Amino acid sequence: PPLHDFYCSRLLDLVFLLDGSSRLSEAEFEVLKAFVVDMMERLRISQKWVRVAVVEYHDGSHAYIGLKDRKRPSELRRIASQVKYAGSQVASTSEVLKYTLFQIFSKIDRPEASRITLLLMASQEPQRMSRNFVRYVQGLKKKKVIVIPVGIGPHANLKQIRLIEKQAPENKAFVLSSVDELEQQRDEIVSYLCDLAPE
Amino acid sequence: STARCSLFGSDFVNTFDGSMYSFAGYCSYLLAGGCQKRSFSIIGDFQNGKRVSLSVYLGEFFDIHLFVNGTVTQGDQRVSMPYASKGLYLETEAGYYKLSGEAYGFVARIDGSGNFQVLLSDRYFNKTCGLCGNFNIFAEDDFMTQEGTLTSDPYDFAN
Amino acid sequence: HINEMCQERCVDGCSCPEGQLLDEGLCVESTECPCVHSGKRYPPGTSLSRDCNTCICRNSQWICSNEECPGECLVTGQSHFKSFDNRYFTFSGICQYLLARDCQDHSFSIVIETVQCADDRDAVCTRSVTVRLPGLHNSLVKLKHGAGVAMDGQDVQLPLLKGDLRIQHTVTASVRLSYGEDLQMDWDGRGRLLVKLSPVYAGKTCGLCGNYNGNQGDDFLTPSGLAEPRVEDFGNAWKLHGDCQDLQKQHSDPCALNPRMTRFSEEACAVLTSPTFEACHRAVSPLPYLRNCRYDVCSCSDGRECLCGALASYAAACAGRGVRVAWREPGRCELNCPKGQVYLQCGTPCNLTCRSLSYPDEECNEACLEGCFCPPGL
Amino acid sequence: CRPPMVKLVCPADNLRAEGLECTKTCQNYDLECMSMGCVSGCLCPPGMVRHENRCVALERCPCFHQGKEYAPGETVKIGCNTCVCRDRKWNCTDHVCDATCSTIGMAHYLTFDGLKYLFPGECQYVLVQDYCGSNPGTFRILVGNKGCSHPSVKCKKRVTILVEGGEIELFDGEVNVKRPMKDETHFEVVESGRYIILLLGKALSVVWDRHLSISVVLKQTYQEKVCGLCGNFDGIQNNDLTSSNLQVEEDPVDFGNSWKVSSQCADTRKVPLDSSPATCHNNIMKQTMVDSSCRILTSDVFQDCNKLVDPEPYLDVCIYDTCSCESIGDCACFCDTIAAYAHVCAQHGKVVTWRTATLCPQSCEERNLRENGYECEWRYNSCAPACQVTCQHPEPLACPVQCVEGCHAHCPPGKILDELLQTCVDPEDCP
Amino acid sequence: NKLVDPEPYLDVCIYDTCSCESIGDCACFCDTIAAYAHVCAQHGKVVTWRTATLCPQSCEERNLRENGYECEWRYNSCAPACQVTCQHPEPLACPVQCVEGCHAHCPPGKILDELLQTCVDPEDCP
Ligand SMILES: *[C@@H]1O[C@H](CO)[C@@H](O[C@@H]2O[C@H](CO)[C@@H](O[C@@H]3O[C@H](CO)[C@@H](O)[C@H](O)[C@@H]3O)[C@H](O)[C@H]2NC(C)=O)[C@H](O)[C@H]1NC(C)=O
Ligand SMILES: *[C@@H]1O[C@H](CO)[C@@H](O)[C@H](O)[C@H]1NC(C)=O
Ligand SMILES: *[C@@H]1O[C@H](CO)[C@@H](O)[C@H](O)[C@H]1NC(C)=O
Ligand SMILES: *[C@@H]1O[C@H](CO)[C@@H](O)[C@H](O)[C@H]1NC(C)=O
Ligand SMILES: *[C@@H]1O[C@H](CO)[C@@H](O)[C@H](O)[C@H]1NC(C)=O
Numbered sequence A: 001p002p003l004h005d006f007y008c009s010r011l012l013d014l015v016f017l018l019d020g021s022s023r024l025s026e027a028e029f030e031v032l033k034a035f036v037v038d039m040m041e042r043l044r045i046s047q048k049w050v051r052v053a054v055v056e057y058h059d060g061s062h063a064y065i066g067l068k069d070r071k072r073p074s075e076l077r078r079i080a081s082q083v084k085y086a087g088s089q090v091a092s093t094s095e096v097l098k099y100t101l102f103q104i105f106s107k108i109d110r111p112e113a114s115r116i117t118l119l120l121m122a123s124q125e126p127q128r129m130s131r132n133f134v135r136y137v138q139g140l141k142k143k144k145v146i147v148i149p150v151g152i153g154p155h156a157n158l159k160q161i162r163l164i165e166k167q168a169p170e171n172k173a174f175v176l177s178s179v180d181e182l183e184q185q186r187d188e189i190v191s192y193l194c195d196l197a198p199e
Numbered sequence B: 001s002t003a004r005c006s007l008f009g010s011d012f013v014n015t016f017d018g019s020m021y022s023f024a025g026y027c028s029y030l031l032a033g034g035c036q037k038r039s040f041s042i043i044g045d046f047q048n049g050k051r052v053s054l055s056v057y058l059g060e061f062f063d064i065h066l067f068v069n070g071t072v073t074q075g076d077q078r079v080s081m082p083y084a085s086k087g088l089y090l091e092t093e094a095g096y097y098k099l100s101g102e103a104y105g106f107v108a109r110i111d112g113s114g115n116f117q118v119l120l121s122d123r124y125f126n127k128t129c130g131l132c133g134n135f136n137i138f139a140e141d142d143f144m145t146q147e148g149t150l151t152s153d154p155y156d157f158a159n
Numbered sequence C: 001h002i003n004e005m006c007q008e009r010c011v012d013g014c015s016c017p018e019g020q021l022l023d024e025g026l027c028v029e030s031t032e033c034p035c036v037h038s039g040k041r042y043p044p045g046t047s048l049s050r051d052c053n054t055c056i057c058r059n060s061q062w063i064c065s066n067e068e069c070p071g072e073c074l075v076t077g078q079s080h081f082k083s084f085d086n087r088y089f090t091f092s093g094i095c096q097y098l099l100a101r102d103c104q105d106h107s108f109s110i111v112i113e114t115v116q117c118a119d120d121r122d123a124v125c126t127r128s129v130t131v132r133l134p135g136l137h138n139s140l141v142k143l144k145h146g147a148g149v150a151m152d153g154q155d156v157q158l159p160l161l162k163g164d165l166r167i168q169h170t171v172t173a174s175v176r177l178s179y180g181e182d183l184q185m186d187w188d189g190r191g192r193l194l195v196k197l198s199p200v201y202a203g204k205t206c207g208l209c210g211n212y213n214g215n216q217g218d219d220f221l222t223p224s225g226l227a228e229p230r231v232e233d234f235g236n237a238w239k240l241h242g243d244c245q246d247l248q249k250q251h252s253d254p255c256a257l258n259p260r261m262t263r264f265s266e267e268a269c270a271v272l273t274s275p276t277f278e279a280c281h282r283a284v285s286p287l288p289y290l291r292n293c294r295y296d297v298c299s300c301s302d303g304r305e306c307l308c309g310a311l312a313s314y315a316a317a318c319a320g321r322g323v324r325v326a327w328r329e330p331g332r333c334e335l336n337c338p339k340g341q342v343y344l345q346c347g348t349p350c351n352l353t354c355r356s357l358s359y360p361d362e363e364c365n366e367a368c369l370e371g372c373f374c375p376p377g378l
Numbered sequence D: 001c002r003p004p005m006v007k008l009v010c011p012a013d014n015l016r017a018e019g020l021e022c023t024k025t026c027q028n029y030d031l032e033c034m035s036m037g038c039v040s041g042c043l044c045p046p047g048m049v050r051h052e053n054r055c056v057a058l059e060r061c062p063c064f065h066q067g068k069e070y071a072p073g074e075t076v077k078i079g080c081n082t083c084v085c086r087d088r089k090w091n092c093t094d095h096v097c098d099a100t101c102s103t104i105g106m107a108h109y110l111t112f113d114g115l116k117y118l119f120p121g122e123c124q125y126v127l128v129q130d131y132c133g134s135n136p137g138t139f140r141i142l143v144g145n146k147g148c149s150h151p152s153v154k155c156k157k158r159v160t161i162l163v164e165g166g167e168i169e170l171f172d173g174e175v176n177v178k179r180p181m182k183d184e185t186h187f188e189v190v191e192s193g194r195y196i197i198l199l200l201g202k203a204l205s206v207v208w209d210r211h212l213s214i215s216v217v218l219k220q221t222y223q224e225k226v227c228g229l230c231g232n233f234d235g236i237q238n239n240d241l242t243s244s245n246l247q248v249e250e251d252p253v254d255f256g257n258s259w260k261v262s263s264q265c266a267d268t269r270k271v272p273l274d275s276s277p278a279t280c281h282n283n284i285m286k287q288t289m290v291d292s293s294c295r296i297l298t299s300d301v302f303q304d305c306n307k308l309v310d311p312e313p314y315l316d317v318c319i320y321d322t323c324s325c326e327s328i329g330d331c332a333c334f335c336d337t338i339a340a341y342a343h344v345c346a347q348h349g350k351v352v353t354w355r356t357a358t359l360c361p362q363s364c365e366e367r368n369l370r371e372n373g374y375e376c377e378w379r380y381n382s383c384a385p386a387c388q389v390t391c392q393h394p395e396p397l398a399c400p401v402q403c404v405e406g407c408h409a410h411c412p413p414g415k416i417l418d419e420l421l422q423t424c425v426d427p428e429d430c431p
Numbered sequence E: 001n002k003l004v005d006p007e008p009y010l011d012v013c014i015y016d017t018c019s020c021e022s023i024g025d026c027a028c029f030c031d032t033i034a035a036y037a038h039v040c041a042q043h044g045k046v047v048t049w050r051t052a053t054l055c056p057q058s059c060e061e062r063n064l065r066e067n068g069y070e071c072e073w074r075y076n077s078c079a080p081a082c083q084v085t086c087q088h089p090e091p092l093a094c095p096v097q098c099v100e101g102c103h104a105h106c107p108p109g110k111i112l113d114e115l116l117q118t119c120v121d122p123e124d125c126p
């Protein structure tokens, strides 16, 4: 039952990567949570069709909902709205990428659906921590994973953006200037994700 | 009834069943005491091969040292001779320093020559597992090492 | 925030002005109140970090990452196992036991050979291991007593750099059997068999190390399902031979059999609780380690050597989680490095072993080791 | 060599085959083979295992739970689940049973998942709770002690139960309802044996020893939905030391201090010593007789239960609470620990009779009609079924325990047990 | 107390109780109080001081019998002196007129036996 207009009721595996850095203020992080909730609201949330997982990284993954979890979509909405604001001084795109590659998506058990990761970067990971970034991106590529980078804030590292796209055919970047643009581009983003529909 | 084992002579031994041998150790070997529920242990202290002191330990708390020259200690302090205590009435019986424990059952003597002695009670029949050999009528199996392997070399079993 | 309890009476006394929440002794601002961990105050936004997960002090709360940390199945001392899920326990059985095996996808079958290592009946330690990596054909590595590597019976001159194996001497006479960045067995030839193991094996191993999911309760699982209440049954279930005696009544107080050692055992395995290790106490509770030290010193051939082993085991446990205590001096134990070598607590392994100079292309992703490194420029 | 099956030794190529050394017994058949050389020995057929004397059917080899061997088709009753020996494996059911968080002794706690730890406290703490996070709270139990820094004779625990409506404070040895819970439909105070078993709600239930042991029983509902000194009841045992501010505290003291309700009361100090507290470690006398006396847990009467439940935590609780607790006359700091272990054993259907005329005596004659005649209306019973039909509770209300020791009024079917006069009288005599 | 001063027994209890490390077996303290109670009883001042939480004394095991429960063996704070029983039919001049402890309050007939600790008809004994 689509809430307003959309229901991407197809086999899909989806993971979110809500950034936990201090760059996104408390209000900005709340807007991001609203984005993720309103996003999953328009998907057929169930292990049969759509698997959703939110993974806040604040220099360490903080998965609140796992793609293997099976609960009422209302409960998942509540949990997503309840993601705490870490407010860390430095996030780590590479660390969350490794987490999803090894501990979230390393035990393929449902090829019917596809693997999509929404990296909502809002801060620049220090170069010293970018040693294995390309390696993990390529590894996810091998695992049939499409990374959709989202350059939320002006400080969002853009070099990594379009570099994730460079090492993949379907990796699309949604570079935004503020969280407000998320509400504007919500429909476009859901549409794009449903173009790569596993049916 | 009661068995008897004595560390007589100079570095000699006589198990509870008659088997005897010679052993001049240095590490205060366990003369007697059950190997399942120890609850006490007579220890024959040794110095440079000579029989120096006969110690008794109750469980893990009470330590008493008798020595061959008549001196006594609690483990860290000296004490007078009669020294009645929790069991272990350490006295002079007939010129020999007698250490008697009846609640557990044994009597340790050290005569002038320094020949130790022990009189374990029957209730340790086949139960004692010290250097004085298990208290079974069979005297040929009194080299039961702590490892549980019956050896024939007296020094292996003693060590 | 336990409301409904403040139901006694008013009292005419001082207070915070309007909004400041009374801190320990100050009326600090509501937002500025710090989180507390291990009796320490940390301003909001602090990034206190655990082994692999990091926590951040939000408003009066810690937002803690919930990743999986690498496992460890240390088997130091006289049968002093510690399952991947920290499950400090002792099992003195003399036979070949399956330390850990990847039951789901067979990729290693580490096995320990245990034998009585002293006169006391309560003195059993592993003397050998039988790493059985089936990926590399069927090599049976045999990291024997005394740090002696042996592949398929044939001895091997370390370092070995086969397909995935990287069996190479560590800083202090301990062969480090690496693998495809998933196994990091360390074996010093006497006891220690620290088995690092990456999270990819979470909840996929068996044997004495039990599962790796992260719950201690399941760690006593036999291959038959039901977990064992007593340690003896659990250990027996993982026995290789059909002939070795099944352990009965795993003894807990070896010091009773040797009353003479009680004084030394009590007064020696107490530095663990002494202020010298108070820095680590919070990092790791020395309850299992103190018990292990007492069981070792009063149960083995050489009391002082086993005291060294136990205290060093606890020090290594602390070091693996940050804090690095001193614990090295006469009265304690000392490394007494050979001529030329020096102690230099927390050195670096890479820049020595001229083999490294020959191969500068190699990397240096290794931390401090506290070994016998060479002096600078050598 | 030995009929009726053929005998083989080795191929003698590179010592690869499995000889007599690697005999596949069912307990070992699943386990990987040995690590030895080809010993040129015989073995059972390929799909055959040499269990007990000789070859035995591979699919018919018994399973083992407590060492003992169960033939295929047998079953065991572990907790509330059940398992059957199938293919040398236990096919267990899956029903997460009730979880109990006992307050063993005067300073030790046992969490729902299983963890036991030491936390000597003087202030008021949170035993179990539902006001954990986002989930709205429904109940809250406080176990505020009083004069119990170290286990002491003058130690009384004041439980405060903040169920939906009102407090049910359990101070002293009685039950006081400071406020009445709005929904009085499900609230029973069953007084049986030595306990005041309650039925706070549909699922939660608190069983009280009336002196110092307080156990809280939950059901599937509260799984992962509780917090406090009893952990989160998530099954996982490692994460049961999560402080109030969510973080797994390494030492139990700093974990417990987080649940101190009164921020100003006091922070229990981190004692450096590990065991042998107070008098112990400085008395020899005391420590020796404490360890000797606190060993009935391993005595013959407990031998049968020693395997079902490990007595080591209760051994530690008995060692503790006895060195510090100077026992004079009211020698209960030790009997209470032994009784707690006996109760835990009984929960596994292994009732044990341990009290004697000397060791922890306990008499019930005072209540046996001592007004006149003192006929045997009351008896001491190790089991004593807890929740029994009576005048106050004629209906068979559900109970969190099965059978609890203490005084028990054994009465024939006629003249069921009454409530006020503590005498079993004609059924019509009830209200 | 007004008939026999307790100070000697107060000292005997303060002593012999601190010295005793009473663990589980609580007789060190209880025995002194029982001795003072016995002395009091000698002066015809019987005192029922035992309780369920102060040095409890039980008698259940006696009544425990194959026939179910006898309900005859009960603790009497004073009880009488030597009671005529099957093995001791004739009366005796006991030094103490009253002695606490367990005793069977058997009905008027079937005086107590010794071996089976149960009171039965006089015929079933010598
Ligand atoms: C009976 O034999 C025992 C065992 O040899 C004698 O004990 C020894 O007594 C001497 C006398 O002083 C002790 O010497 C002192 O030792 C202390 C501590 O080592 C040292 O600081 C002093 O400077 C002095 O050397 C000796 O330690 C002690 N040995 C023990 C107790 O093992 C005992 O004296 C003999 N009986 C008589 C009456 O001499
Ligand atoms: C010694 O003990 C063993 C095992 O407990 C027993 O089989 C044997 O009969 C005992 N020996 C004697 C002489 O009783
Ligand atoms: C030792 O290791 C350090 C690590 O930074 C390196 O810089 C140095 O070149 C190495 N060699 C010496 C002699 O210090
Ligand atoms: C348990 O038994 C059922 C019914 O026989 C069967 O379908 C299921 O596969 C069994 N599970 C296991 C783990 O043996
Ligand atoms: C306790 O009561 C039950 C049933 O009332 C009975 O079967 C059992 O024998 C009793 N145990 C005693 C009296 O020790």
Ligand SMILES: *[C@@H]1O[C@H](CO)[C@@H](O)[C@H](O)[C@H]1NC(C)=O
Pocket: E075, E076, E077, E078, E079, E080
């Ligand atoms: C004790 O016995 C005496 C005489 O038999 C009796 O008068 C008294 O009431 C008894 N006391 C109790 C408590 O039964």
Ligand SMILES: [Ca+2]
Pocket: B017, B133, B134, B135, B136, B137, B138, B139, B140, B141, B142
């Ligand atoms: Ca013999």
Ligand SMILES: [Ca+2]
Pocket: C071, C073, C083, C084, C085, C209, C210, C211, C212, C219
């Ligand atoms: Ca493990």
Ligand SMILES: [Ca+2]
Pocket: D113, D231, D232, D233, D234, D235, D236, D237, D238, D239, D240
């Ligand atoms: Ca838990």
